[PDB]
Amino acid sequence: TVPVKLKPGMDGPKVKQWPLTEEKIKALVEICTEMEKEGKISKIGPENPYNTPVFAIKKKDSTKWRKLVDFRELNKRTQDFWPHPAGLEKKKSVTVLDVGDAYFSVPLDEDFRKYTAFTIPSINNETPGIRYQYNVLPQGWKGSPAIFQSSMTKILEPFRKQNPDIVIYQYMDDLYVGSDLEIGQHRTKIEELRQHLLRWPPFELHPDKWTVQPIVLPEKDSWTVNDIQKLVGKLNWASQIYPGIKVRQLCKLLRGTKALTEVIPLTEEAELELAENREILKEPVHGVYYDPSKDLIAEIQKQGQGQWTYQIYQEPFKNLKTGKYARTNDVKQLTEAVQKITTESIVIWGKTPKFKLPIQKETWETWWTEYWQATWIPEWEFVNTPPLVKLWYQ
Amino acid sequence: PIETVPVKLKPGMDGPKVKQWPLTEEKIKALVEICTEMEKEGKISKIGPENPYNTPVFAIKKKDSTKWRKLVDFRELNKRTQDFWEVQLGIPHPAGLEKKKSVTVLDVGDAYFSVPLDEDFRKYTAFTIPSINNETPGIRYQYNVLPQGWKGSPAIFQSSMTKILEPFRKQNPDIVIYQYMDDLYVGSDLEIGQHRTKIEELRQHLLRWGLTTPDKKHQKEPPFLWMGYELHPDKWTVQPIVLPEKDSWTVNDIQKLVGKLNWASQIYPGIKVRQLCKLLRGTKALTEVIPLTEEAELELAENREILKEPVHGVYYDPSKDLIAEIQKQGQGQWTYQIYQEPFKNLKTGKYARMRGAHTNDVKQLTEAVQKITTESIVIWGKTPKFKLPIQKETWETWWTEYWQATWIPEWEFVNTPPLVKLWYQLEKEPIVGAETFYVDAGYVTNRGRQKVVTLTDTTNQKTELQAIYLALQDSGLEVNIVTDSQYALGIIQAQPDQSESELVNQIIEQLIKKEKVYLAWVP
Ligand SMILES: Cc1ccnc2c1NC(=O)c1cccnc1N2C1CC1
Ligand SMILES: [Mg+2]
């Protein structure tokens, strides 16, 4: 085992466990009861004051439950360990594989196990609740992938030299296998992997198509005072980014106090300005690169009608990406989107971003696990998106 | 014997070294008696002059007796001792229990004093008993079992108990046991005699570990009063609440009454404190007497009546679905009931939480639904099917116009006034032929009209809503309003129906009147 430690000075996590449904609890019991039999985990005693919340999510294309342990706090308190494929996103199509079970065959430094304590609560606090800690490398922990790195190269060695046509990237419990081969000749080399892996794992992304939704301006037959006003307001907001945007000429049609619905013919001078403003918006602003030293932020907006919008930046307005997601219920969608964005974020930069979700914390904390499927959990906070902003997207 | 839990002092820190304060020869004797007995029984052990650690101890007299009782002040040791797994924070709610035929409660005497202490820690539990002779040194002991007053006792005791109960619970899956501090509640559906018999089995099983308990003649009988409730094996309620009968009320009395009234609302529907609570406005002292307004008197009277006849909560029948029903019982006031059997409440309640300065009934209702949902998962580990006074059409509409996401489990409309609705809606497109008002403390319209007024005791954004307000007043049934206030925009766009701000309310009032209103924003 490897002597792991928390970042200097730091102690272990003591995260409250969000109440669970009788269903999820029963599942977690059947599971932990079993991991206990196989020595992966062990019941702990009162001398352990640490805690990490545990949840149960269902696997996609599987009737079985998966134990999702939210080691977010613990991962922050863990020490750092001392390479992302510049072309994984370039690749035509990538598949994602869960190799979390790889860890369940490697011990966890004895003096560190205390820090992985977690609890299976009981309905209405009628019983004290089952307490365990890990003996093997736990799925979801920052240290597992790291500590298992060696053993992982020693195993991806053959496929890597055998098939140097496919790029393989690992991220925590997941494996991103990319290539440009035919989708049939792909889904194959993938199963050829699931086999070279069983020799020691359940589940296409196509990072090729991932596009940056530009800002758009209404193309109207006729233009009313209102239309122009929405136009100017939006443009003005965007002049913050693309300073070449002018509205001087558009504001001229808006002098006086006309009737909102009054149709306005657009002056020659003005129609030539809009076109320039349109051209400028066709592509993302220049000189905005990804700083590895900065957190990735991801904001979402409910557009309505089952349509959402996101943007990934580090500095305000300086967007690294922008997208849109479309169809359930509001919550299901938002969770599916978060994941979709997290994956992409991983695929492109190798780090999950920090989301700013438009929903009450209690509502989210309540249903998010009903549709979550990823093995990781991004960081997130809850916000109250303004109107104007939402209007300026999609 | 039970397993020993490994204790350690907090990092870096060292054991306590508190000098023993002086003790009357009288107390000295009594202690030497108490401690000599403890050393005979193995709970403590005479130690050597090598141990530097010390904890102060003193004697206390127990009601009824010439005898004294020993008390050890483990504060410092407590400060220097590690943190343990939080002794049960959450308690069950009567409504989550399933009825039993018989329920027996048992007190565990010799609680801590019957559980081993980690050998490496015993050296910190050192205390000294001063001798009466001046030349003679007083005796020093240490603990061998969990000490009363020590930090890790509550948790390590429960830990042990749970382990001790393991087998018995397995051999008896038909018996339910809830552990609470030194008490133990045991229910079963066995026949009277069989139940009493099992109790005796448990009693002996626990005693096999030195844990003593009361025999049938000495056990407390139902209903058991617990955490403010009055529990039967078949039904539950809050313990009898009596309402003061007087003509002089202080702020203290009113606050206590309101507090008492809230407690009851979880079983007694119809309880209201809106008027009593009002009596609290501007109060200067806790002893200030506030006359009961005519409405507060009427309120107290209805609650008093509601509380005259007891009502009981039935227990959870896991075979049946949970049904939840919400009612709007006044502006910002809601009431809900949770039952399985048509109208036999497992529990009730009232939500009055306004999240944010402005809001509408839909938001509020929805938040009430979320609050209830969370509550149920906690008590019954499942969410109830809801009965709501809102129509799907209405809800759905507001849903898709709102920028925030939200969900509502299975729910059916219940035509039970008042039905929640939206009192108004902003046109999606500007109104043709409807005058256009441009506001910026005044306004100007395309039809030539205008008006300007000055305002005092006004905040910046307050004047902003004023403009919009004036415009609504002066406009006709249909009106287009243009503003540069992102602030006012949001507020109104949110389509609130209630607010703290009077101004907002008037605006809402205006808004409800109009046929068509279109609001626009401009930088
Ligand atoms: C205080 C408490 C907490 C949790 N459950 C119970 C109790 N007490 C009871 O009196 C009770 C009453 C009816 C059914 N179960 C009950 N019991 C269960 C143990 C039989
Ligand atoms: Mg203006």
mmCIF file of C-alpha atoms in Angstrom, chain A residues 13-14 44-51 112-118 131-133, chain B residues 5-6 82-86:
data_model
loop_
_atom_site.group_PDB
_atom_site.id
_atom_site.type_symbol
_atom_site.label_atom_id
_atom_site.label_comp_id
_atom_site.label_asym_id
_atom_site.label_seq_id
_atom_site.Cartn_x
_atom_site.Cartn_y
_atom_site.Cartn_z
ATOM 1 C CA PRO A 13 -14.269 15.220 5.753
ATOM 2 C CA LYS A 14 -17.387 15.345 7.919
ATOM 3 C CA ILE A 44 -16.163 1.034 11.694
ATOM 4 C CA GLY A 45 -16.749 2.257 15.231
ATOM 5 C CA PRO A 46 -17.452 5.503 17.125
ATOM 6 C CA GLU A 47 -13.755 6.343 17.128
ATOM 7 C CA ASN A 48 -14.270 7.505 13.534
ATOM 8 C CA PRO A 49 -15.852 10.997 13.299
ATOM 9 C CA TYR A 50 -15.479 11.289 9.522
ATOM 10 C CA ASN A 51 -18.151 11.041 6.880
ATOM 11 C CA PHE A 112 -5.853 6.569 5.472
ATOM 12 C CA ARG A 113 -8.853 4.267 5.465
ATOM 13 C CA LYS A 114 -10.379 6.202 8.353
ATOM 14 C CA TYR A 115 -10.918 9.126 5.974
ATOM 15 C CA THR A 116 -13.177 7.114 3.624
ATOM 16 C CA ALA A 117 -15.926 6.570 6.258
ATOM 17 C CA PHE A 118 -19.483 6.691 4.977
ATOM 18 C CA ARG A 131 -21.021 2.824 9.170
ATOM 19 C CA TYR A 132 -18.168 1.605 6.966
ATOM 20 C CA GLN A 133 -14.786 2.652 5.616
ATOM 21 C CA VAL B 5 -13.054 1.142 21.244
ATOM 22 C CA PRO B 6 -9.616 2.743 20.647
ATOM 23 C CA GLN B 82 -10.833 13.272 20.059
ATOM 24 C CA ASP B 83 -14.180 13.781 18.330
ATOM 25 C CA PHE B 84 -16.452 10.783 18.071
ATOM 26 C CA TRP B 85 -19.175 9.802 15.658
ATOM 27 C CA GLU B 86 -22.020 12.176 16.395
#
